[PDB]
RNA sequence: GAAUGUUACCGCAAUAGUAAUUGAACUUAGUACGAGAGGAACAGUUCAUUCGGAUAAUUGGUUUUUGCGGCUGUCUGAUCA
RNA sequence: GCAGUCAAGCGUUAGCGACAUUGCUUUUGAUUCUUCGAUGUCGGCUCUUCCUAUCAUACCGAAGCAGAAUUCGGUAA
RNA sequence: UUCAUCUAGACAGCCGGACGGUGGCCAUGGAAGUCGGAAUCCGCUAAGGAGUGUGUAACAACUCACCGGCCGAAUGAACUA
């Protein structure tokens, strides 16, 4: 999988897992066998249990390595990554180690059983188990090292960052201690230290911001010293793989003040030598520390340098700072109209004669005021009435009795809906003597016709 | 009152039309010695198309009861029950496949699923 | 995700103000709890808290044996240095392995009345040449999963194990009939291909073949391990 | 797995007795007043009520629903007598009994067999020694004031005035929720030969547990895996709890039956009358539920032995309308005035 | 106006309401949550009448109406249609629709001025629903889709249907009901937009997996700000 | 062990004879069991035998045998019980082998081969006789038994050998007598790859009238013109896909495969 | 069934056995935690499988009401009952 | 296991020997397509009873345990 | 039982010193003693480890190895029954 596997199940060291399956073996297993039991029932219940130690290992052993994040062919960025953090040739034969000791623990269980089958002293299939446990602790004791160094590679692993280099993402980088955390940090909602030092954020922290209703993730890293491309550190073995697999163009940063003392010069000159890494990207350019510097009153001389900046087609040379952040709106919109010119490239009612209507908002709505819930000065919102009630589970809701009616008092009235024959309903209706003033006279003709007399 | 038992073929009752389904197997069924699972209106179970559309048939789907068929005694004391047993099928969630339902469906199907209320015209 | 920012949350809160006298009140406590479990962990479990406790006291008399020491203050080419390192048999006198139950009877027919059927018990090699014969014949039967080709071979010299196979039996003792039945029967002495070492007579005439004896017991041991008698 | 029953019901042997002992009573609550902590009566049949509930959370919130009750007799009640008890290390100790000699012929046939053949030489003789100026029960009184921390009252059902006529009365013990024992005592002496209401010693949508015995079925005496090598059913006391009582029953007169709601005027009597029972005269307790039993076995009443706080118990009912169609076959009106005016006039008419 | 709204658990706002230019309905069962969060953006104008239509909680699809009237199904009970009419305006009218089909709101779909019905509907159902809301009726089906309210939702001002559409279905549809019509998508692409939200000429409800684009459509078609 | 009758039998057998159908001998030509022969077996000459050979052309048989005789004798056999065909072949080769290994005095020979394929009607018509119980079903014998003739060799029978492999492919294994149709609950599904295999006219030939397409259609009329159908025309594909699958394992309809 | 001079009522308990079980819809929650993905339980209500104690008004089978009306053939000479 | 290695201690006091320790113990998550003569009556239904060397529920504990969720020591029949 | 501490102040308890070249040499964005590793010096004394730990980007911040200010009489370590 992808996106985190920290969900790798932390195996516990080589010699506490071997006694966490010895511990397991036993209790799962009967114990109490004696000699004066049949041969068969002994030789059985010697094989279950091997049988079932065997099993116990080979299924470790296999979720183990299914855990793994499968670094062959996941993703070149991912892969590079990978091999960086923890030097991916070891990986790779710390993982083919485990798969040998796990087939080799599969072939002496299955050589055991198969020999354990003809013991006929019970003591002769006791030092048969006893040697298969011995062989299965010595195929695992070799194991401590490469197991070691996976837990440690895991608890590294888990707490990587989580990034598709497919998706649309926008990147900053530049020289150490340019204000470029500050800048990840004020950009999107991200907390990252803002130590003066050029090495703060060490890891490659993600930062995620959202913009023309799209969300746009970002990176950090510390950036690249001379690096003549011989003497590279991890730290910025990592920056040069993440900006050349990653997606459109990374912000280079650039402190243009005394702070980031290499000469402007050095600064030109590292990104003029990373140009290879321009190919398609479009890169932009971001001045840092503005404020204290406005680069309009700068040397002609070190002014060249800047034009010379400009020079690569398809830059910019845009004003930022860190203590006033109001140049960030500007970047973050620049970078992402650019992100998505890049991603782009790539690639009635018919008015039928008869209708007339208006926007039919009542006039209670277009009159009434706006609601706040913060302002304690607000409607009653019945549901604080329940809150304090104690909520759902013993509010009685009662919107009865607070309905519009006629008068007042029907609002406690209990309609009785039954009155000994069939519901009102079916004939309840307003002045209901229309169906009484006939039935006198229908009354006195019925009697009166001789049908009773 | 428990519905169909395990393995009944019921009717299908969705738009895009099946002959039946198989009831293979019932979700938060009562297990217990010799009680087999029982599935009733309104229950999420996984029931293989029996037969039906030639890529829906041998693949097990969750099927959605619609109707029971069986007397059962609802907190209204009526003792109402229905034509014959049908289900409609979607996935875990209630998504139904089809984009319409046949025949009528109950209050107490309906109640469990919003989707399959909105997605059934003629309710109880 | 998120790297080891945790550390950086513990240093934005720093050490719960309890942990650190949590943690100092539970570390003067782990003593007083040993001393109290070395009383308790019953069966099962006071033998593993032994061992663990004489392992690590060992540990720590070897460690201050060595601070105390260094407190204190077979010549190899240049090419292998940095690198990694009265004709009686070792084991005269061998178990006397009766002719018992060993040889166990396998009852056959439908009535179990004639088995006249024997089955060794005894790890026995035998080779391309098996060629098992009708059932009717099997006098002896050495089952397949009690065969093995292949016997741990060592010698006092670089303490090397090699698995060589198994060339064939010269001399079994106490009935040497087994030695005609291949039986491994610990106390044998078996010919073993020691082409891997290449060790070569005086004369140029490179050996590849030497006799050695079985040290372990296979009936006992899923392995067979043998001394080369050089 | 489980087995045929639970073990703690077994030996199942048949009850000792029809009437179900009360095994213990609620707590004796001193700030409270005098009131009873339990009744005895007959039960003499189910119904079905239909009403709605204020359950905010519940799936059927504000909607109707039918649930089981049942009607129980429990006409007036008039106290025979009082008995006290001591605490000892044997337990609890019956001290002293007492008595009005105001006894009706219904006690006196259940303290005789053959009441026919008796000569009915009843109390009389001890009572001579109470028809007098007094001084003797004033002796009781005091020793039961000085000793006896607990008063259970002695109470006798009405069986004569049962719908089902009957001469033979049941007795039974009933403890006091009232202060120190002497208020007991004295409102258990003012209250020789008065009259009991059932409407005072419960209320609507009061919790409270019963104790009766179960319809007997006769001898009820196959795997031949039982043992290891290394016989009736019905008729025992069992008990019940948390049952809702929805309305108290003033069978003494009309509009018992119809709610606020239906008004439809009649009694609760089921048209016909209740399957082998008569017909429902005097005051009566509706309970939700069932309880153990079958018409006119005598049943007990009591208030859970403890004190409920859960809403199930808070909530009120809101009786709507009751039923009361001919249990007698497959009824379909509840008064002859529906039948009449289905069927209009008959034969029988003209 | 528009604002997130979440049910207990569910999506499908529409199936436990049904939101109108004078009055909504709005299920007994769960909590005031719901009650107290469409009474923020409703205020106080008109009634919020908690009531159950059969006893289930799915009053949004079995019942439907405009400003003029609201019209139930016959499953309904005596004492629910009693409530309503004590509940609603002298305005708004209530009758016990004697027809075959129960869920007139997703068998119909309606507004202030135009009425969608079921192409086999009872001409006397037909005739009463005109009468009631006073508005136009047509027998018309959204791409084959039988039930028209369960996809179709339709207000004063533009109108929603599900995805599924098809380009010249939803232009017929358009010059017929005279609004504009988008073939939008709520609820993270859920098909069932015309039964699990409401909306109307000044609010707009619909569950939170309503993402942001979604809201910006449903804002650009219903023209709230 | 009643599957490892296969090892029983290597062990046993001095030379191992292997059986394949003349359809497709590659399917019944597992390489696994080979491996392992030649690993620990250099002993053992591991013959092939063609069964099945009257059941394809002539000219399909020839040049399995021609592409086969890379690395096996390939000798043609039928498996007829008195009108054989490649005996005298067979017994000859037999004879060679008993006169190579005179100085042992004692050989036996064992069968290798999918259940059914021709290993008990084989012996039998070896022994020009039924000793070994024959019928058209996968499992004719649960254990290994010993049969002599010409008082020098022997003959091992063992069960059908079908040795795991992730790569099964349940419709390919259903394509030959390994499975027991009978107990299929839903044999319509593999139907149709017949047509895969075999010819549209042989079935025509040996399937009433035809001009089918969506095979589930072809079902549907056989069962109408059988009478199997059931009331308002719904076939018993159950009964007609179990005797659709039992012909084809019979060899009913003729099908056959060439090699590159 | 002898208990305890006789009978019947009320009760206490020395003693034997003991049971309930598990899950979920909400509230608190799309909040704490989350750059994102995802996301609780501490309180109160409300439901659910199995099992234990009971039935008997509602519902299925079991019918010796011989109960109702009728159908095939026989009989008191077809039909009376 | 065999043959050593260091040697807490006992040593005829040259030998032993606790714990560790080296060699058997396809380095690129490949696939072994391997599953090798158990000569014996047992096998499976229901219910009960007993143990804990306990799977869930319950108890609390140690974890790169931030949550979800996961690894494990222990109490508990 | 043996070996040392001793009124040239017995063990344990409260306070300070714990230096100067130095931030050793190679590894190098940081190893100022506590991520790598060779020796671990000389100056200096009552005493100082190119460091025992806790913790830091980098020292920094705190403890003892070792000593002294008060105490105040036996104490510490390994074995045997
Ligand atoms: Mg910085
Ligand atoms: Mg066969």
Redesign the interface.
């Given at each position: 999988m992808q996106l985190?596997w920290?969900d790798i199940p932390t195996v516990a060291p080589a010699n506490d897992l071997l006694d966490i399956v010895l511990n397991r073996t036993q209790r799962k297993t009967p114990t109490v066998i004696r000699p004066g039991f049949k041969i068969t029932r002994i030789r059985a219940f010697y094989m279950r249990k091997v049988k079932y130690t065997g099993e116990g290992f080979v299924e470790k052993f296999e979720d183990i390595l299914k855990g793994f994040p499968n670094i062959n062919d996941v993703h070149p960025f991912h892969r590079d990554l990978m091999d960086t953090l923890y030097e991916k040739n070891h990986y790779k034969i710390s993982l083919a180690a485990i798969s040998r000791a796990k087939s080799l623990v599969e072939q002496?269980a299955r050589?055991?059983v198969?020999?354990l089958?003809?013991?006929?002293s019970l003591?002769?299939c006791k030092?048969?188990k006893r040697?298969?446990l011995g062989?299965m602790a010595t195929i695992v004791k070799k194991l401590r090292d490469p197991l070691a160094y996976l837990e440690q590679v895991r608890q590294?692993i888990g707490?990587?960052?989580?990034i598709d280099p497919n998706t649309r993402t926008l990147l900053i980088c530049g020289y150490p201690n340019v204000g470029k955390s500050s800048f990840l940090r004020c950009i999107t909602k991200s907390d990252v230290?803002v130590q003066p030092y050029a090495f703060t954020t060490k890891?490659?922290?993600?930062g995620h911001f959202?913009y023309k209703?799209?969300r746009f993730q970002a990176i950090d890293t510390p950036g690249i010293l001379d690096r003549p491309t011989e003497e590279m550190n991890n730290i910025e073995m990592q920056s040069i793989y993440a900006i050349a697999h990653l997606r459109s163009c990374v912000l280079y940063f650039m402190d243009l003040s005394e702070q980031c003392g290499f000469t402007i010069e050095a600064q030109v000159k590292l990104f003029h030598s990373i140009k290879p890494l321009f190919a398609n990207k479009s890169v932009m350019v971001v001045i840092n520390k503005t404020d204290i510097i406005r680069p309009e009153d700068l040397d002609e001389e070190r002014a060249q340098l800047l034009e010379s900046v400009k020079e690569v087609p398809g830059v910019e040379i845009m004003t930022s700072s860190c203590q006033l952040e109001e140049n960030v709106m500007e970047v973050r919109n620049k970078a992402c109209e650019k992100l998505l010119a890049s991603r782009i490239e790539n690639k009635?009612?018919?008015?039928?004669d008869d209708?007339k209507?208006?926007?039919?908002?009542?006039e209670?709505?277009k009159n009434?005021?706006k609601?706040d819930?913060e302002d304690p000065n607000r409607?009653k919102?019945?549901?604080?009435?329940?809150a304090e009630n104690g909520?759902?589970?013993?509010?009685?809701?009662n919107?009865?009795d607070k309905?519009?009616?006629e008068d007042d008092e029907?609002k406690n009235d209990?309609?009785?809906?039954?009155?000994?024959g069939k519901?009102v309903?079916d004939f309840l209706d307003p002045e209901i003597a229309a169906k009484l003033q006939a039935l006198e006279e229908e009354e006195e003709k019925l009697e009166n016709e001789g049908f009773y007399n | 009152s428990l519905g169909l038992p395990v393995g009944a073929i019921m009717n299908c009752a969705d738009n895009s039309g099946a002959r039946n389904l198989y009831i293979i197997a019932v979700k938060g069924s009562g297990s217990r010695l010799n009680r087999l699972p029982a599935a009733s209106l309104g229950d999420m179970v996984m029931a293989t198309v029996k037969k039906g559309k030639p890529e829906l048939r041998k693949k097990v789907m969750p099927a959605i009861v619609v109707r029971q068929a069986k007397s059962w005694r609802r907190r209204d004391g009526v003792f109402l029950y229905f034509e014959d047993n049908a289900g409609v099928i979607a996935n875990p969630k209630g998504e139904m496949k089809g984009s319409a339902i046949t025949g009528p469906v109950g209050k107490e199907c309906a109640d469990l699923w919003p989707r399959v209320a909105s997605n059934s015209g003629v309710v109880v | 995700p998120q790297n080891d920012y945790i550390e950086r949350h513990i240093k934005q809160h720093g050490k719960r103000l309890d942990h650190e006298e949590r943690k100092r009140k539970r570390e003067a406590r782990e003593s007083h709890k040993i001393s109290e479990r070395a009383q308790k962990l019953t069966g099962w479990k006071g033998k593993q808290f032994a061992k663990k406790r004489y392992a690590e006291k060992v540990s720590m008399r070897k460690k201050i044996k060595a601070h105390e020491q260094s407190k204190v203050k077979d010549a190899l080419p240049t090419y292998l240095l940095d690198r990694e390192q009265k004709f009686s048999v070792p084991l005269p006198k061998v178990r006397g392995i009766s002719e018992e139950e060993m040889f166990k009877v396998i009852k056959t027919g439908k009535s179990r009345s004639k088995s006249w059927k024997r089955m060794i018990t005894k790890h026995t090699f035998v080779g391309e040449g098996f060629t098992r014969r009708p059932v009717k014949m099997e006098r002896i039967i050495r089952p397949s999963a009690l065969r093995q080709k292949k016997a741990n071979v060592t010698h006092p010299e670089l303490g090397v194990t090699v698995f060589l196979p198994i060339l064939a039996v010269k001399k079994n003792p106490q009935s040497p009939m087994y030695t005609q039945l291949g039986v491994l029967t610990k106390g044998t002495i078996i010919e073993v291909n020691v082409s891997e070492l290449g060790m070569v007579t005086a004369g140029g005439k490179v050996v590849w073949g030497k006799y050695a004896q079985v040290t372990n017991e296979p009936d006992r041991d899923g392995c067979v391990n043998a001394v080369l008698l050089v | 797995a489980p087995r045929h029953g639970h073990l703690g019901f077994l030996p199942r042997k048949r009850a000792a007795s029809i009437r179900a002992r009360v095994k213990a009573f609620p707590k004796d609550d001193r700030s409270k007043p005098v009131a009873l902590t339990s009744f005895l009566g007959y039960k003499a049949g189910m119904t079905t009520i239909v009403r709605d509930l204020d359950r905010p959370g519940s799936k059927f919130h504000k909607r109707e629903v039918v649930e089981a009750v049942t009607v129980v007799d429990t006409p007036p009640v008039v106290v025979v007598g009082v008995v006290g008890y001591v605490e000892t290390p044997r337990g609890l100790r019956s001290l002293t009994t007492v008595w009005a000699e105001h006894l009706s012929d219904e006690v006196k046939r259940r303290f005789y067999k053959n009441w026919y053949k008796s000569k009915k030489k009843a109390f009389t003789k001890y009572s001579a020694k109470y028809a007098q100026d007094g001084a003797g029960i004033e002796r009781e009184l005091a020793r039961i004031k000085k000793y006896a921390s607990v008063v259970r009252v002695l109470v006798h059902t009405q069986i004569r005035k049962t719908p089902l006529a009957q001469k033979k009365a049941h007795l039974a013990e009933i403890q006091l929720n009232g202060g120190s024992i002497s208020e007991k005592v004295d409102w258990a002496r003012e209250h020789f030969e008065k009259t009991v209401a059932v409407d005072s010693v419960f209320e609507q949508n009061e919790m409270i547990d019963a104790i009766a015995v179960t319809k007997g079925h006769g001898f009820e005496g196959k795997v031949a895996c039982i043992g290891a090598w290394h016989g009736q059913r019905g008729y025992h006391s069992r008990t019940s709890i948390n049952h809702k009582i929805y309305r108290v029953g003033k069978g003494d007169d009309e509009a018992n039956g119809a709610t606020s709601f239906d008004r439809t005027k009649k009694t609760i009597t089921p048209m016909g009358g209740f399957v082998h029972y008569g017909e429902i005269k005097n005051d009566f307790i509706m309970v939700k539920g069932c309880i153990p039993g079958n018409r006119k076995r005598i049943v007990t009443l009591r208030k859970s032995l403890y004190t409920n706080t859960s809403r199930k118990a808070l909530e009120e009912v809101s009786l709507k309308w009751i039923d009361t169609a001919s249990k007698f076959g497959k009824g379909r009106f509840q008064t002859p005035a529906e039948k009449h005016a289905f069927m209009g006039t008959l034969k029988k008419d003209l | 106006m528009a604002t997130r709204t979440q049910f207990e658990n569910s999506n499908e706002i529409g199936v436990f309401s049904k939101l109108t230019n004078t009055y909504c309905l709005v299920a007994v069962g769960g909590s005031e949550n719901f009650y107290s969060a469409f009474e923020a953006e409703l205020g106080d104008a008109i009634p919020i009448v908690h009531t159950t239509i059969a006893g289930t909680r799915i009053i949004g699809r079995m019942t439907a109406g405009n400003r003029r009237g609201l019209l139930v199904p016959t499953q309904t009970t005596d004492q629910e249609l009693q409530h309503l009419r004590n509940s609603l305006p002298d305005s708004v009218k209530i009758q016990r629709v004697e027809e075959r089909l129960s869920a007139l709101g997703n068998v119909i779909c309606c507004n202030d001025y135009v009425a969608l019905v079921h192409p086999d509907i009872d001409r006397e159902t037909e005739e009463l629903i005109s009468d009631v809301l006073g508005v136009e009726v047509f027998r018309q089906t959204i791409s084959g889709n039988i039930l028209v309210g369960s996809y179709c939702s339709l207000s004063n001002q533009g109108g929603l249907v599900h995805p599924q559409t098809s380009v010249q279905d939803q232009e017929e549809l358009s010059s017929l009901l005279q609004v504009p019509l988008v073939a939008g998508t709520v609820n993270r692409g859920s098909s069932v937009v015309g039964a699990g939200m409401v909306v109307n000429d000044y609010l707009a409800v619909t569950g939170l997996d309503t993402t942001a684009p979604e809201l910006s459509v449903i804002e650009s078609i219903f023209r709230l700000q | 062990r009643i599957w490892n009758e296969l090892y029983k039998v290597i062990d046993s057998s001095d030379v191992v004879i292997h059986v394949l159908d003349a359809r497709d001998p590659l399917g019944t030509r597992c390489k696994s069991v080979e491996e392992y022969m030649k690993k620990e077996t250099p002993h053992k000459h591991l013959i092939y035998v063609l069964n099945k050979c009257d059941l394809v052309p002539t000219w399909v048989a020839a040049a399995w045998v021609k592409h086969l005789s890379k690395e096996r004798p390939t000798l043609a056999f039928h498996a007829s019980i008195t009108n054989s065909f490649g005996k005298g072949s067979l017994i000859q080769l037999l004879r060679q082998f008993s006169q190579l290994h005179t100085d042992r005095k004692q050989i036996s020979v064992g069968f290798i081969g999918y259940p059914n394929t021709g290993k008990s009607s084989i012996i039998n018509t070896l022994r020009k006789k039924k000793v070994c119980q024959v019928a058209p079903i996968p499992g004719e014998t649960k254990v290994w038994q010993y049969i002599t003739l010409m008082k020098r060799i022997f003959l091992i029978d063992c069960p059908g050998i079908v040795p795991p492999s992730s790569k099964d492919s349940e419709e390919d294994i259903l394509f030959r007598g390994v499975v027991r149709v009978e107990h299929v609950t839903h044999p319509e599904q593999y139907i149709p790859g017949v047509l895969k295999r075999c010819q549209v006219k042989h079935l025509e030939r040996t399937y009433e009238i035809s001009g089918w397409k969506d095979a589930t259609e072809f079902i549907e009329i056989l069962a109408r013109k059988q009478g199997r159908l059931l009331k308002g025309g719904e076939p018993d594909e159950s009964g007609v896909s179990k005797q659709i699958l039992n012909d084809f394992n019979r060899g009913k309809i003729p099908w056959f495969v060439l090699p590159p």
């Open positions: 985190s920290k002496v050589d055991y198969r020999l089958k003809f013991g006929q003591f002769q030092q048969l040697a298969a062989r590294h707490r990587l960052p989580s230290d890891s490659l922290y993600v959202d209703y799209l009635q009612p018919q008015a039928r209708v209507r208006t926007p039919f908002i009542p209670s709505v009434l005021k609601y819930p409607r919102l019945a549901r604080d009435i329940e909520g759902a589970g013993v509010f009685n809701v919107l009865k309905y519009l009616l029907w209990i309609m009785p809906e039954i009155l000994d519901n309903y | - | - | - | - | -």
